[PDB]
Amino acid sequence: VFMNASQERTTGRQAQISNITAAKAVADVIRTCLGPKAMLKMLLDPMGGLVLTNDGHAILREIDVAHPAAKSMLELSRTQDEEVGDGTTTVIILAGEILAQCAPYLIEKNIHPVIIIQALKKALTDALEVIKQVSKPVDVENDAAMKKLIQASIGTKYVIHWSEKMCELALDAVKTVREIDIKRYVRVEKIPGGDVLDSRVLKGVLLNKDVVHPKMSRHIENPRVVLLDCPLEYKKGESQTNIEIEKEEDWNRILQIEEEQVQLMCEQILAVRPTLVITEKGVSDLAQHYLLKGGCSVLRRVKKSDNNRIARVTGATIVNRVEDLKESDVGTNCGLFKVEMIGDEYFSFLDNGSGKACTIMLRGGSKDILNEIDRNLQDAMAVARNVMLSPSLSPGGGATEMAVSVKLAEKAKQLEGIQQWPYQAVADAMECIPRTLIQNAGGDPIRLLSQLRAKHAQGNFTTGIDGDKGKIVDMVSYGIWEPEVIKQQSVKTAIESACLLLRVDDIVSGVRK
Amino acid sequence: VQIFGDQVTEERAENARLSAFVGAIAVGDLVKSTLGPKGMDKLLQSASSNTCMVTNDGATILKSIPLDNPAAKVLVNISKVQDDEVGDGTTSVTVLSAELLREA
Amino acid sequence: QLFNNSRSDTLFLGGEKISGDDIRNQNVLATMAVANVVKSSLGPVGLDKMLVDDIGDFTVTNDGATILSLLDVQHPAGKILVELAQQQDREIGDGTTSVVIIASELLKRANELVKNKIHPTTIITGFRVALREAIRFINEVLSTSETLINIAKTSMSSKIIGADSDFFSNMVVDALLAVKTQNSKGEIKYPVKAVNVLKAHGKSATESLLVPGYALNCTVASQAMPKRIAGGNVKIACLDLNLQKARMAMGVQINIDDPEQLEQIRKREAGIVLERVKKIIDAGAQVVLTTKGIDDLCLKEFVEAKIMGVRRCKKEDLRRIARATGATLVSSMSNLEGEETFESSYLGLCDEVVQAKFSDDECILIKGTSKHSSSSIILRGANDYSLDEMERSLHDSLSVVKRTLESGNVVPGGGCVEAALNIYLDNFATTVGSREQLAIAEFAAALLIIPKTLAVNAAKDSSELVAKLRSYHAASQMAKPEDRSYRNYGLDLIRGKIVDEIHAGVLEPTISKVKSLKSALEACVAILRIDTMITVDPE
Amino acid sequence: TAGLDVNEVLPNLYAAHNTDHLYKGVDIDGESDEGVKDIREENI
Amino acid sequence: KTSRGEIIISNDGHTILKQMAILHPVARMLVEVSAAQDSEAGDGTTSVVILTGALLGAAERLLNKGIHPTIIADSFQSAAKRSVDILLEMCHKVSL
Amino acid sequence: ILIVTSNQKTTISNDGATILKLLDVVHPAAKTLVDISRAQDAEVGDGTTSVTILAGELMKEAKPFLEEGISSHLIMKGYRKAVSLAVEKINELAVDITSE
Amino acid sequence: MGRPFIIVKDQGNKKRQHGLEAKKSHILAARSVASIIKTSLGPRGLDKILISPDGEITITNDGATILSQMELDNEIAKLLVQLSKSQDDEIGDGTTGVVVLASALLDQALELIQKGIHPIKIANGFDEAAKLAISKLEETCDDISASNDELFRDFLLRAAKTSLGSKIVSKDHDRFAEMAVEAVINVMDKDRKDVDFDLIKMQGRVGGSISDSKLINGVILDKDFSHPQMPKCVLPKEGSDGVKLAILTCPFEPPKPKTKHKLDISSVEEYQKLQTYEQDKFKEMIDDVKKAGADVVICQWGFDDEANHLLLQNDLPAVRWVGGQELEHIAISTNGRIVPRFQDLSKDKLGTCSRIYEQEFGTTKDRMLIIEQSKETKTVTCFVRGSNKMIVDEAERALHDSLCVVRNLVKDSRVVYGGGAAEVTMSLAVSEEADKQRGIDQYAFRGFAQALDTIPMTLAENSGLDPIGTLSTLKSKQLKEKISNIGVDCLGYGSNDMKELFVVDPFIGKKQQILLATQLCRMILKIDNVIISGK
Ligand SMILES: Nc1ncnc2c1ncn2[C@@H]1O[C@H](COP(=O)(O)OP(=O)(O)O)[C@@H](O)[C@H]1O
Ligand SMILES: Nc1ncnc2c1ncn2[C@@H]1O[C@H](COP(=O)(O)OP(=O)(O)O)[C@@H](O)[C@H]1O
Ligand SMILES: Nc1ncnc2c1ncn2[C@@H]1O[C@H](COP(=O)(O)OP(=O)(O)O)[C@@H](O)[C@H]1O
Ligand code: BEF
Ligand code: BEF
Ligand code: BEF
Ligand code: BEF
Ligand code: BEF
Ligand code: BEF
Ligand SMILES: [Mg+2]
Ligand SMILES: [Mg+2]
Ligand SMILES: [Mg+2]
């Protein structure tokens, strides 16, 4: 052998085409999932589940892609979700028509890639300054002005029907985790049936465990709470202890030490005047007797992550060592403990001071369509958390994108030379969002892009498309405004993308290691 | 360095003499019992036809049985020759033919 | 090139042999095979490749040695150039692609002298002569030197971050210039990879923020611990021993004979740890960084004491935090007497210990070290393929800066070190004479491959630049003492005209061209000495 | 096919074509690397 | 290239012979002679083999000419005795 | 050269056209060298070997220019005149032997 | 820069022997071929027993035969088969030594090539050396042209004697030789000095001993007499001194035309006129012969049943169905002429014989027709007999070799002396001029002569004497004396004098047995690039 054989080399313009081809035909599978008139691409996963949504990244995420340029494209909607939450659809459509409007028109006119990258790198530094100057800063704590945010960002996927409730559930979830937040202290326990109008953010945590002993109370008024990082049975010697019995009596004395060890725990647990005791590990069948006589309803084996969630609500701190259980570690101001029964299965609630973790109870019409709502609420809770960090808002609905078009269409003419061709094709690219927004609506794109581009030049930044109508609309008067970081990152990575794939001129296949 | 084609056999001097002798002596030692008054007959049988023959005529034995050993096939012919040129002495020819080569 | 016949006299097993001309050629063909893959990837106008794992999983890069590493090479005399390609990346850091293409043309040309009639011993003596003269010439055409911002930026172009070269220029320079250290009682070298590089997929490429401290890719082990501690003079405990419960030391067994000792012995398995935890808390430690484990038992002790404490962190990281904050690594603390004590002076002083949220991932930052400057780079960008390469593109660019700082000499690159050697050596060819002449002559012209392919890769014509470049370098040998005033050198490829690469700012390090050729020779020498190959089949 | 600056020939060819303009069309070689040729004179 | 996989590039003759895969038992005897020269001198492992190849070629022609190999062998070893004597008389000593 | 053809036909020769014909050249670009030698046997008889030799070495010494960014159109526009000048060199060099 | 390519067609099935390591594999190939035969040279030679793919047995000494049978594969060996095959045609004898010399020459070349010498210079060195050997032989060779009639007939026997003593025919080589000479005198036109081997027929019938192999002055047929009642002997009518033969090429059958035909008989009486034409057309055939005065009818095509009995009644012994070639031989031995149609038979176109007799060829087998003469006739049938199919064939193959050495002596009436002598003089003569050649060729000439010495050495070898001894006694006795006709006493008499010993080889024989070797040797040396396809 010379190299290794069984190696398909694609070189030159030949290799270039393969990348732009795939990257643009990636946008194609999601083009009809943009905006309001968008659809639901129902997906069959590998091992037998089902996913059917709009959430761009959740569609791609469940597609297997082989051609590296599309493997690079799909794993690029991942960066977007892992930063903002919404805009995972947009990113890929731009990533495509930056490579589409830009590349073939000008790579097949002999222009060298490395000039194009420098040309498209300037078009971003320019594009970001445009978005930030066409946006308007917003009051993050005008509780009702922030609901207009969320109202707009859910007005896309099947959840619209009940936006009013969802925004209250989204905004009230982020309100009680704010010093700045992390939306993973927010368990979203999905419970099938009822209807959405039954969903209620609980300032607290919900558990699927029942009280370990029948006699223990299923209703405590104001429970003092202890949280445990340790099992409630006798531990063994971590030093491989073994017992060698000689005398007759020896047996009972030891076999009670374990009976006593638990009573030494229970005496130490109960010594903090508790009424509730929750453990990460399992609870003994003798531990329940001494905690019944202690008057404490006990909960066993509860998720490690659910403990940090509870300890944040109740205010108590979790301790591994029973020996050193202090006065601080008890649940001051948890207003209630109940075990209500939601048709067959027992759930334990913890309701009512200073919260910093929260449980979203969701109700729908199936365990299947519930997930598709959670996919909408996660995209809702995201647009609310963005804004509290980056207080500014872009005027969306194609308007922010068209703004970047004629600002870059002016800058290109004023640049001239050779660097102009690639630069005048990011301006070409931006209009693709309006273009698909007219399309998904169903109006004539050319007729409406015309009355959009020119009606933007001397007609304000906030001039975009109304989804359901398919007409030009001043987005100030309408109420579609997308958070500023979405428009920022969307344009950021989508170009960072097109400028990674352009550097490719050669594809060597069959590499190994 | 091989010279000939495949499935070709080269029995040289030392080994060629072995074939020559072993072949003749084998044929001689086959008809030895045919010779003489108180001599005995052979029962030849072909695989083809299901036919046979109970014979003494040394030629009829040798002319019948198949053989590979060239040195043997030589004495086989000299047996036919004798049957052609005299009619009798088929066995005598072959035995004396072999015994000379045995003594060689 | 008809497949050869196995001899009818010799008898070799699971092995055949090709001799004289058949081998010499097969070596050059396989050498060109390896070299020609990565010629496209040479120069600022050079491009990048996409290397499919076979599962579809891939890596995109320029860095020659990583491309060569990745290609499955089957021939001995291919893997030799690949073994050199990396021997480059461990002795210079950059120039990996160049050194391979030089070695190839040295072989190729050397062979075309043997494929004429000239003996290999003549040529190998004729390569020895040229190299002795080229390095002597390089040192007499080196410039000993602001300047670091160029040497960085020269290793930026040809790779992805060359479009944002100026940023990733001052990144590289400051990052390194802030880990200066002395060894062996005076050696002032800048540590080979002390700048801990992390890459997270988010934000923009320009928004990759240098850390004025150190980047740990770990989190505050317990969620109830403070995810920040700020203000001047913060105390950090760099640990190495685990904080868990022990199995009876080692050779220790348990025979319980008096039942009451069950709980006595079991409880004391907690103590030893809780006692070592206490000797840490009570030392005035606010932040703990332990290489080995932390028990849930010993977390609840940090939690309540508001000690932000990490577990299972790379010891490679912790020693560079030991050398930077003031701290000393604690393998295990036993005094002059047997007693296990922990003095407060063991800890490192810093500014802040902040766990910072980057694109769906939190990690701890040790801000503002006191005992010595420390620097870390957190890259940001499109996806993982994007980040991967710009980390490898940094490792190449941080490298060329290191060797500048380690060796007080730079060369005017841009292929003018090469171009100048072409005509100097070609003119030196007459000084010897005979058959040894064509050898040096082929060597002098075998250096053309760098300046040639740089301009091929631009798609446009090469010879226009190439030969007109030679004339300018042929204008330095007929140039008088005072009349210098004729001396100039360099090449530009974006605009495509000959430019002064010292004034332009194109700078490759001194060693990067010496240990470049030095190796390239002992490559083709070994291959040219090959006249018979004997390949024996697996066990 | 001639290996000339596509981006530098086409603008130089259009410019010279805006009645002696009617004859101007592209040519091969180094002097014509400047641009075009008067096609009326080369018998083309 | 080793049976095992390792690449070996050499000029040392014993190192060359040991690592190629010689199959013919009599040919393998040659490796032993080349090994024995290394274990008596470390140099001349190439010289010693070529000599056997030209001495054997000698022996061949003599066998062509019909000389009993026992005589050849003994007189070839009588050729050794007289030759090593010559080298011992022709050599110029060295100050140690 | 001793060539044994696919049909057991054993031939020995020095005649270039005969060697290149008995060699089955499949490569379509290397079939030019068989037709280049065949034409020499048709018009002359001798040279058959030399023509191919010349042909190859022209393509061989054109590789170093092609390795650099040079158009093949310009290379052969320089060979086309060179041969037309090589013929002019011979015509003035050819000795009319009836005279001397 | 690596593409898996297709230059030549079916490239995967083409192996290439290259440079020196190829030449070794070529010479050693010829070497092995030589070792097979070298033991079969001279009167002390031994025979090779080859078997055909079908299973037919051959036992021979004729070198050409030996090599012709063996299924060979190595291209150099294949070439040597044709080398011996060549000699047999050009001469008939020598086929054995031709190959030995060629291999020894190729050996000598191998020894010199490993000394770093260009092979084309060696081949050119050989040919200039071969042209010096043949010149010394032409200068020294003895001549039978200046002889009387009594001595010429003796030298031809001496050559026959030499050619035969080597093969199992050696038993009766007094008889066998005296056949080979008798055959050539009879058949070759003196002034044309040209002998046709289409004139001498080889016939072989198995039976009795090789002693019983006679030469018959006429022809022997595998045909009987047409009618069983006909007599065996045919005696010449007293006053004629000959038998007379009706040699015919027409059937004793009612004449029928060549072009397609048919009758169209309507009248019954006209079918009767046809019926009485059948019998009459027959009687007009027998009267036609009886009136020509012939005693025996020999005809090419077959006799009709009615025509056979009327051939008996009128005392006309007949030979049904005679071969085309065989009729030609009858008409030439009997002096007669060949007669197309009955109308053309005349008492002048009759064949004169001394006897015609149906011999009981076998004791039980079949009868044969011998047409003999007491006078010398242009065709002569050579009837070989033996005790075995394999002896018969080899005896025929021994006569044909013996017959050839006499045919060569009629063409070139000059002789040289064998037993190595001829090879020795050449070796000596080339040897002395090697020092006078000098330069590069000094080794090539030395080679040529030294390789020649293998012929006498391998004679002395097979015969059981020391190779160096016989060589150093022989080459030396050919310098101390002026004589160049000193050889080896392979049989084992006191002298080395090949003259007095009657070991005689023709001249052209020896010369061709050198030129063919050196020329082919040049061809192998010229080869260095080898390309072999697949099977
Ligand atoms: N009712 C509407 N009419 C027109 N444009 C809209 C409307 N709602 C949202 N948009 C625009 O479309 C985008 C939302 O579309 P969506 O399918 O959610 O894409 P993504 O998942 O990328 O956010 C917003 O960024 C906004 O600019
Ligand atoms: N801006 C530039 N102008 C001209 N030449 C350059 C420029 N940047 C780099 N080079 C040249 O190209 C070479 C860089 O090679 P590169 O393709 O990065 O791979 P490697 O460094 O591994 O050989 C350097 O030797 C340098 O001489
Ligand atoms: N009676 C003899 N005495 C000495 N030499 C002989 C005698 N007969 C033949 N020779 C030699 O031996 C050779 C006979 O070999 P032979 O087996 O007949 O094969 P070829 O066909 O080569 O003659 C001749 O070259 C001749 O010189
Ligand atoms: F369809 Be999306 F990512 F709101
Ligand atoms: F065996 Be026999 F022919 F009397
Ligand atoms: F392609 Be390199 F290692 F700058
Ligand atoms: F090749 Be050696 F043993 F110096
Ligand atoms: F090889 Be040639 F046809 F003179
Ligand atoms: F063996 Be030979 F052809 F007289
Ligand atoms: Mg570089
Ligand atoms: Mg010629
Ligand atoms: Mg003879």
The DSSP line for G30-73 is HHHHHHHHGGG-STT---EEEE-TT--EEEE--HHHHHHHS-B-
Backbone angles phi, psi at C224, to 5 degrees: -85, -15
G145-217+378-413: which CATH topology?
A: GROEL; domain 2 (3.30.260)
G95 catalytic per annotation: yes
Query: Using CA atoms, how far apart are residues G143 and A355, in angstroms rounded to an integer?
Result: 138
Asked whether the beta carbons of B92 and B32 are under 8 A apart, the reply is no
Dump the DSSP string for C309-377.
Answer: EE-S--HHHHHHHHHHHS---BS----SSS-----GGGSEEESEEEEEE-SS-EEEEEES-SSS---EE
Supply the CATH classification number for the domain C1-145+409-539.
1.10.560.10
G217 C-alpha vs ligand 9 centroid, how far in Å? 27
Contacts of A225 (CB under 8 A, 6+ apart): A274, A275, A276, A277, A278, A310, A314, A316, A330, A331, A334
Domain extent listing, chain C: 1-145+409-539, 146-211+373-408, 212-372
Q: Which of G58, G60, G65, G96 is catalytic?
A: G96
- Which residue from C92, C68, C70, C89 is spatially nearest to C80, judged by alpha carbons? C68
DSSP of G257-310, one letter per residue?
A: -SS--------HHHHHHHHHHHHHHHHHHHHHHHTTT-SEEEESSPPPHHHHHH
Q: Whose alpha carbon is nearest atom 12 of ligand 3?
A: G42
Largest CA distance in chain B: 56
| Residue nearest (by alpha carbon) to ligand 7 atom 4 | E43
The DSSP annotation for C143-197 comes to B----HHHHHHHTTTTSGGGTTTTHHHHHHHHHHHT--EEETTTEEE--TT-S-E
Chains that touch D (3 or more CB pairs under 8 A): A, C, F
Please tell me chain D's helix, strand, coil percentages from 3-state DSSP, rounded to the nearest 5: 30, 15, 55
Contact G244/G339 with Cβ under 8 angstroms? no
DSSP letter for G351, please: P
Do residues C362 and C356 make contact, with C-beta atoms less than 8 angstroms apart? Answer: yes
Residue G166: CA atoms inside 13 Å, Cβ hemisphere, count?
A: 28
* Sheet strand arrangement including C348-350: C308-310, C287-290, C234-239, C348-350
Q: Both tokens of residue A194?
A: 């009822």
Cβ < 6 A, ligand 8 pocket: F 14-16, 46, 48-49
Residue G492 burial (C-beta neighbours within 10 Å; 0-12, 13-18, 19+): exposed
- The candidate with the shortest Cα–Cα distance to G495, out of G417, G433, G426, is G417
Do A and B touch, 3+ Cβ pairs within 8 Å? The answer is: no
Coil, strand or helix: which one is A470? coil
Long-range contacts, E1-6 (Cβ 8 Å, 24+): E1/C15, E1/C76, E1/C533, E1/C534, E1/C535, E1/C536, E2/C536, E3/C14, E3/C15, E3/C536, E3/C537, E3/C538, E3/C539, E4/C538, E4/C539, E5/C538
- Pairwise CA distance, residues A91 & A87, whole Å: 6
Show the tokens assigned to C101.
């293409």
Structure tokens belonging to residue G134: 């043949």
G36 CA → ligand 9 middle, Å: 14
Cα(G250)–Cα(C64) distance, rounded to whole angstroms? 97
φ, ψ for residue E79, nearest 5 deg: -80, -30
Question: Which residues lie below 8 Å from residue B71, measured CB to CB, with a gap of 6+?
Answer: B19, B20, B21, B22, B23, B24, G49
Experiment used for this model: X-ray
Angle between helices A445-457 and A399-413 (to 10 degrees): 70
Sign, CA torsion A256/A257/A262/A263:
positive
Which CATH number applies to C146-211+373-408? 3.30.260.10
Number of H helices, E strands in chain A: 20, 22
- Residue C174 CB coordination number (10 Å): 17
Query: Going by C-beta distance under 8 Å and a sequence separation of 6 or more, which residues neighbour residue G169?
Result: G176, G210, G394, G395, G398, G399, G402
For residue C239, give the H/E element and its range.
Answer: strand C234-239
Q: What are the start-end ranges of the H helices in A214-328?
A: 250-269, 287-292, 304-314
Neighbours of C26 (CB within 10 A): 18
| Nearest ligand atom owner, CA of F16 | 8
Phi/psi for C287 (5° steps) reads -135, 130
Task: State the Cα–Cα distance between residues C92 and C406, nearest whole angstrom.
Answer: 11
Q: F94 CA to chain C: closest CA distance, Å?
A: 31
G62 as an active site residue: the answer is yes
Other Cβ atoms closer than 10 A to C503: 10
A88, A163, A378: which to mutate for ligand 4, most atoms within 8 A of CB? A88
Q: Count the alpha carbons within 13 Å of F90 in the hemisphere toward its beta carbon.
A: 6
Q: Residue G83: how many CB atoms within 10 A of its CB?
A: 26
Euclidean distance between CA atoms C327 and C291, whole angstroms: 14
Burial class (CB in 10 A: 0-12, 13-18, 19+), C263: middle
Hey, how many other C-beta atoms are within 10 angstroms of the C-beta on A2?
18
Characterize C121-151 residue by residue with b for buried, 16 or more Cβ atoms within 10 angstroms of its Cβ, and e for exposed. ebbbebbbbbbebbeebbeebbeeeeebbbb
The shortest C-alpha distance from E19 to chain C (Å) reads 9
Task: Please list, in sequence order, all residues whose beta carbon lies within 8 angstroms of the beta carbon of residue G406, skipping any fewer than 6 positions away.
Answer: G156, G159, G160, G180, G181, G183, G184
Alpha helices in A315-458 (DSSP H): 367-389, 399-413, 420-423, 427-430, 432-441, 445-457
Angle (CA) A348-A349-A353 rounded to 5° is 150
CATH architecture classification, G218-377: 3-Layer(bba) Sandwich (3.50)
Distance C163 CA to ligand 5 centre (A): 112
Q: How far is CA A347 from the centre of its chain?
A: 26
Whether A232 lines ligand 1, by a CB cut-off of 6 Å, is: no
Burial (Cβ within 10 Å: 0-12, 13-18, ≥19) of residue A139: exposed
DSSP assignment of G197-256 equals TTTEEEEE---S-GGG-EEESSEEES---SSTTS-SEEPPPGGGSS--EEEESS-SS---
CB atoms within 10 A of CB G63: 29
Q: Which is catalytic among the residues C59, C61, C66, C96? A: C96
Rounded Cα gap, residues D16 and C46, in angstroms? 35
CB atoms within 10 A of CB A5: 11
Name chain C contacts of F65, Cβ cutoff 8 Å: 463
- E12 C-alpha to center of ligand 7: Å? 4
Ligand 5 atom closest to Cα of residue B57? 1
> Which of E9, E45, E49, E51 has most ligand 7 atoms within 8 Å of CB, for mutation?
E45
Residue closest via CA to ligand 7's atom 3 equals E45
Query: Which residue in A has a C-alpha nearest to residue D3's C-alpha?
Result: A110
Residue from the list G1, G11, G25 with its beta carbon closest to the beta carbon of C7: G25
Partner-chain residue, chosen from G25, G363, G388, that has the shortest CB–CB distance to B77: G388
E strand map for G300-365 = 318-319, 355-359
User: Rounded CA gap, C313 and A169, in Å?
Assistant: 39
Please give the Cα distance from A434 to D19 (Å, whole number): 47
Nearest CA to ligand 4 atom 2: A55
Give the C-alpha separation, A156 to A39, whole Å.
Answer: 9
DSSP letter assigned to residue G372: E
Using the 8-state DSSP alphabet, how is residue A211 labeled?
Answer: P
Burial of residue G263, with CB atoms counted within 10 A of its CB: 0-12 exposed, 13-18 middle, 19 or more buried: exposed
Q: Do residues G197 and G416 lie in contact, with contact meaning Cβ atoms separated by under 8 Å?
A: no
- Phi, psi angles (nearest 5°) of residue G11: -60, -35
Q: How many CB atoms lie within 10 A of CB G434?
A: 21
- CA-CA distance, G307 to G287, in Å (whole number)? 11
User: What's the rounded Cα separation, in Å, for the pair A422 and A403?
Assistant: 18
Element (H, E) at C28: helix C21-37
Q: How far apart are CA C439 and CA C121, in angstroms?
A: 10
Q: Is CATH 1.10.560.10 the right assignment for the domain spanning G1-144+414-535?
A: yes
Supply the residue whose CA is at minimum distance from atom 1 of ligand 4. A55
Alpha-carbon span G217 to G371, nearest angstrom: 8
The two three-digit tokens of residue F66, written as one number: 């092609």
**For residue C47, which of C32, C60, C58 has the smallest C-alpha distance?**
C60
AA identity, residue F77: K
Q: Check CB contact under 8 Å for A3 and G2.
A: yes
Distance CA E11, CA E46 (A): 9
DSSP tally for chain B: helices H, then strands E: 4, 2
Find residue C143's DSSP bridge partners. C410
Query: Cα–Cα distance between G515 and A182 in angstroms, integer?
Result: 105
Chain breaks in chain G (C to N over 2.5 A) after: none
Secondary structure (3-state) at A1: coil
What is the distance between the alpha carbons of residues A315 and A332, in angstroms, rounded to a whole number? 6
Mutate which of C1, C3, C8, C72 to disrupt the G interface (most G C-beta within 10 Å)?
C8
Report the pocket of ligand 7 as residue ranges, CB < 6 Å.
E 11-13, 43-46
Pick the atom of ligand 4 nearest to A80's CA: 3
Mutation pick for ligand 3 pocket among G452, G503, G505 (CB with most ligand atoms within 8 Å) = G503
Query: By three-state DSSP, how is residue A376 classified?
Result: helix
Strand pairing category for G529-532 and F2-4: parallel
In degrees and rounded to multiples of 5, residue A472 shows phi and psi of -70, 135
Q: Which of G31, G103, G468 is most worth mutating to test chain E (most E CB atoms within 10 A of its CB)?
A: G468
- Nearest Cβ partner for G466 among E57, E61, E66: E66
Q: After which residues is chain C broken (C to N over 2.5 A)?
A: 145, 483
All residues of chain A having their beta carbon less than 8 Å from the beta carbon of residue C37 are 3, 508
Contact A204, A334 (CB under 8 A): yes
Residue F95, token pair as written in the block: 């000795």
C246 near C271, Cβ under 8 Å? no
Determine C/G contact with 3+ CB pairs under 8 A as the test.
yes
| Domain spans of chain G, in order of start | 1-144+414-535, 145-217+378-413, 218-377
- Of ligand 6's atoms, which has the minimum distance to the CA of residue C96? 3
Give the pair of three-digit tokens for residue C251. 């050779």
User: What's the gap in Å between C506 CA and the centre of ligand 2?
Assistant: 9
For this structure, is A32 an active site residue? no
G residues 4-23 near A, CB within 8 Å? Answer: 4
Q: Please report where in the chains the tokens 């030494």 appear, as a residue.
A: A264
Look at strands A276-279 and A225-228 and give their pairing.
parallel
Number of H helices, E strands in chain G: 17, 17
Distance CA(C81)–CA(C503), nearest Å, equals 34
Q: Give a three-class secondary structure readout of C471-501.
A: HHHCCCCCCCCCCCCCCCCCCCCCCCCCCCH
Whether G533 contacts chain F with CB within 8 A: yes
